[PDB]
Amino acid sequence: MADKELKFLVVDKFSTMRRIVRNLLKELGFNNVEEAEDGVDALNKLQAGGFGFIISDWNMPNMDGLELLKTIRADSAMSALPVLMVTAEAKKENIIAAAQAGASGWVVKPFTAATLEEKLNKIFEKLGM
Amino acid sequence: MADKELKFLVVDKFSTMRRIVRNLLKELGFNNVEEAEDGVDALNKLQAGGFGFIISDWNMPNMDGLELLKTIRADSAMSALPVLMVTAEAKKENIIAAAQAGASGWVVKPFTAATLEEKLNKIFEKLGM
Amino acid sequence: MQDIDLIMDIPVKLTVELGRTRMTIKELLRLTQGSVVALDGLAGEPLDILINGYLIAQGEVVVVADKYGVRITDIITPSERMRRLSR
Amino acid sequence: MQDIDLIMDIPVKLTVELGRTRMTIKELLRLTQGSVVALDGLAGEPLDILINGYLIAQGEVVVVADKYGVRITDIITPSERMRRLSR
Amino acid sequence: MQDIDLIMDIPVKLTVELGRTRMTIKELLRLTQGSVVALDGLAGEPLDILINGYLIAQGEVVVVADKYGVRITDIITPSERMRRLSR
Amino acid sequence: MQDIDLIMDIPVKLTVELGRTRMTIKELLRLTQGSVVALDGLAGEPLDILINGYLIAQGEVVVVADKYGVRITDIITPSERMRRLSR
Amino acid sequence: MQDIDLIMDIPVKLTVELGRTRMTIKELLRLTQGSVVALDGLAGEPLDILINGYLIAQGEVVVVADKYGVRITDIITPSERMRRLSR
Amino acid sequence: MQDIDLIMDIPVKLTVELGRTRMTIKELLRLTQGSVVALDGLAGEPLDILINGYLIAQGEVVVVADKYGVRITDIITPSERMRRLSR
Amino acid sequence: ILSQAEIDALLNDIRPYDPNTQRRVVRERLQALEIINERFARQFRMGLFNLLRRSPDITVGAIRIQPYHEFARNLPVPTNLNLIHLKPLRGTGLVVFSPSLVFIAVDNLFGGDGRFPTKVEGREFTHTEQRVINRMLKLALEGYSDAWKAINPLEVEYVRSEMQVKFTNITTSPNDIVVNTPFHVEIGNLTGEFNICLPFSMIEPLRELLVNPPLENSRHEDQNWRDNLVRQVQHSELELVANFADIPLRLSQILKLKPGDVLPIEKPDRIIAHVDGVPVLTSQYGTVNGQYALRVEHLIN
């Protein structure tokens, strides 16, 4: 089983979506969840450290999800940190670019709690958690 | 057990906070408590002597907690005097600077009486009291 | 006979039926206080003895000191079982 | 075995009891729709199995294809017999 | 209400039955540890509620904080009662 | 017998029961002044003797000089214990 | 041992007394909700253990898993017996 | 009030009982120094208050300055009384 | 911003009975209190949404029951303590507002973007902050009173405000048992909390009312249901036991009982009939139709 004290960073431009994701994570047993409004704030909070999983939106102001993922992978201290990508449009080119950047998973809005739980379980199994 | 007659110096810019700290110390069995409004008054009362423990706020007028701690450590007669640091913001840089200055403990506002008691017990155990 | 005594240790109910007959519901509605209904069994024939609704023996009516009683006459056996089945 | 078959040709009723409890009639009158009554038996304990009101065994609740079922676990046994009678 | 209170000052026992079934004694003897017995009641149906062996209501099984509970659903009523009797 | 005398040194209460019977609460409410209730025990049978509600012996009613008395007749033993248990 | 078993097949009631004190009825009438009454026994002393009102031992109060309990400490002993009777 | 005063000029004894339990004499003989006996009352429940052995109220244990005390909570009332009796 | 644990890491079945514990604790679950708290929570969420023009998320925590001193020991200081009265129940209730929640409300009311959280310096609340706390407390008390209506109509009245627990004096002793219900409030990226603490003695008379999870009843449907239930129970059977008399003896005399031994008993003028040990009537004994009969004289009322 995955560690229930794992710290999650939810990054999205909409506060309501972040609250929904936090509630879904709480229903799954994860209570250590922090929220970020854009890529810059997400990177600033990542520089603090202590996070074990990232859920980030694709299109965000001042930094999109792809650039944030590339910056995370470029950092040695956070290159192995799993990142979950949530988007509104599942274009093949964007998915391929994210996979080349090192995305751990992909979620398409709208989605159900079952899909999110399945994605988290698959990511944890791939990482051996 | 720590000596119940140990003299405590509470330093804070707010009188209400000093009264709260004094009452918390009294509930813990320590009745010899004096109050200081800023770093200058705290140092002046320290020059009188007889104090065994110091609880000081970080941001204080005319002298901050870090400068007061540095002055206390620079004095041979008071270099071994334990100092407890209480702050409103627990910035990593400030905590590292205080640790390098020789801080005996750290408390973050707001806090409970249990946390203060635990910090005092840990400091006393480290000093062998 | 240990298991036999084990099962015997259960209270059961015995039922004695005066007789049986078949009639229509209209005839039942025509019945009032004082109405007369005939039974298919002849007068004096041994009455059916039932355990939890299962016929196992036949008996005759007797009066015991101020109480009705049934005198055990004859049991069943697959022969009578089938006999009454056919009957 | 002859008597065993003779009594085998008889139907009997089996009763399974969820649990037992004691309460006052006033408390019973205080019970309405949605009221909650606790039972003296712990959750998960085997339920009493009764034949015509006589406790002979204990069993566990199972679901069979869409129907409730009782899994036979252990016979009543007589020391426990007296103990439960005393209860 | 006076007689209601007079009888209210009396304790009575309530009994909840999981289900009822009929089987032969031979089948009962064939039962061992781990044996399975099916009940005539469908899974999920409200369970019979009995006072001193008298069926007066039906209820559903609930768990209360660590204890089994019966949720009162409906009274016995005369027709359902006669139906269970014929059963 | 030291511990035996030790426990004997405790006062206890003895209870004699005239008889036992079962009736419905409706019948109890139908009872008024002068009403008659029959008991399951035959007239003249020895009455149950109870210690703190526990049946240990049987006795017969006698009159002693102006007072009722119970003549000890026979005790119990697991045989009668079980016998009355089954009875 | 035979008589020991014969009396062993009997239920008895055990009573534990917190303490004893003497007061006038006027003082009892002066007692209201929240009133305080002192006991003659010192705090922490073992409490009297009584069987059917007869003091036979002393014990200490303990809490067992969520229930009060009495830890057996010492028997009454007869010199102390007379002394307490005299008290 | 006249009779109230007349009986007020009388001393009476008040008794507080920690709890009640039932055990066999064999178990009592198995009790030694340090033995543990459980009580039927739950920990924290108000203790029975008795006047000359008669239960009239319930109270809670308090410590008064170095002495045990009983805080009056509620009178016995008839229903609770009959309930304890049936117990 | 390092947590306390991070700061520390970087820097580095038989129990004795204590009569000072007031063991009158409710080990039964207070569902009804949970329902009231959920209703209160929702009603307040609305009120906060109306007041702050923002959508709040209020989560009800577990209803922990603990002694008053433990509750006081776990309260962050300084804090906003409000004394309330729950009429007609006797006692003083506490509504605890954490400084974080007060600061969040002040930020939202006065156009705060929420991007700059205010760190608690340990200072006293200002008059404007006091008025904001006032408004929040009025909304909370209205919601609590409305929530309590369905189970027991209670009037909630504010008494006074304090900043230290020692001044509350809501319990007679520090070891008294109190009922505390923590609440978590989330507004945007800011999280706040507030607590409602009630002494158990205040709600002790309503113990049975608080126990079961109740609701959705009626007046005529329930009347018919009760009437039919009473009718059904009347058919139940009871075992009527009549005791001839009682003899006070000793166990030694029991061991000496032999066939023919006569035990003297007092002749009873009346025979008392007991149902499961509970007397129901007094009667005279007799013989009718060859069986012992009882002639009822009085019914025990």
Residue numbers in the entry:
A (entry chain BB), B (entry chain A5): 1 to 129
C (entry chain BC), D (entry chain A7), E (entry chain A1), F (entry chain A6), G (entry chain Az), H (entry chain Au): 51 to 137
I (entry chain A3): 5 to 16, 34 to 322
Give the original sentences from the paper that presented this experimental model.
The bacterial flagellar motor is a huge bidirectional rotary nanomachine that drives rotation of the flagellum for bacterial motility. The cytoplasmic C ring of the flagellar motor functions as the switch complex for the rotational direction switching from counterclockwise to clockwise. The basal body is made up of the LP ring, MS ring, C ring, rod and export apparatus. Here, we present two high-resolution cryo-electron microscopy structures of the C ring-containing flagellar basal body–hook complex from Salmonella Typhimurium, which are in the default counterclockwise state and in a constitutively active CheY mutant-induced clockwise state, respectively.
2D classification results showed that the C ring in the CW state (CW-C ring) also possesses a C34 symmetry. The density map of the C ring in the CW state was finally refined to an overall resolution of 5.6 Å with C34 symmetry. The subunits of CheY** and the CW-C ring have clear densities in the density map. There are in all 34 CheY** subunits, which are bound on the outer surface of the middle subring of the C ring and form a CheY** subring structure. The CheY**-bound C ring in the CW state has a height of ~160 Å, which is the same as that of the C ring in the CCW state. However, the upper, middle and bottom subrings of the CW-C ring have diameters of ~446 Å, ~440 Å and ~470 Å, respectively, which are all smaller than those in the CCW-C ring, indicating that the binding of CheY** induces a more compressed structure of the C ring. The inner diameter of the inner subring is also shortened to ~312 Å. CheY** is bound into an open groove between two adjacent protomers on the surface of the middle subring of the C ring and interacts with FliGM, FliMM and the prior FliMM domain. However, in contrast to previous predictions, CheY** has no interactions with FliN and the bottom subring in the structure. As the consequence, the whole FliGCC domain undergoes a rotation by ~180° and a movement by ~8 Å toward the next FliGCC domain and inward contraction by ~10 Å to the center of the C ring, which results in a reversed orientation of the αtorque helix and changes the periodic CCW distribution of the charged residues R281 and D288/D289 to a CW distribution on the upper surface of the CW-C ring.
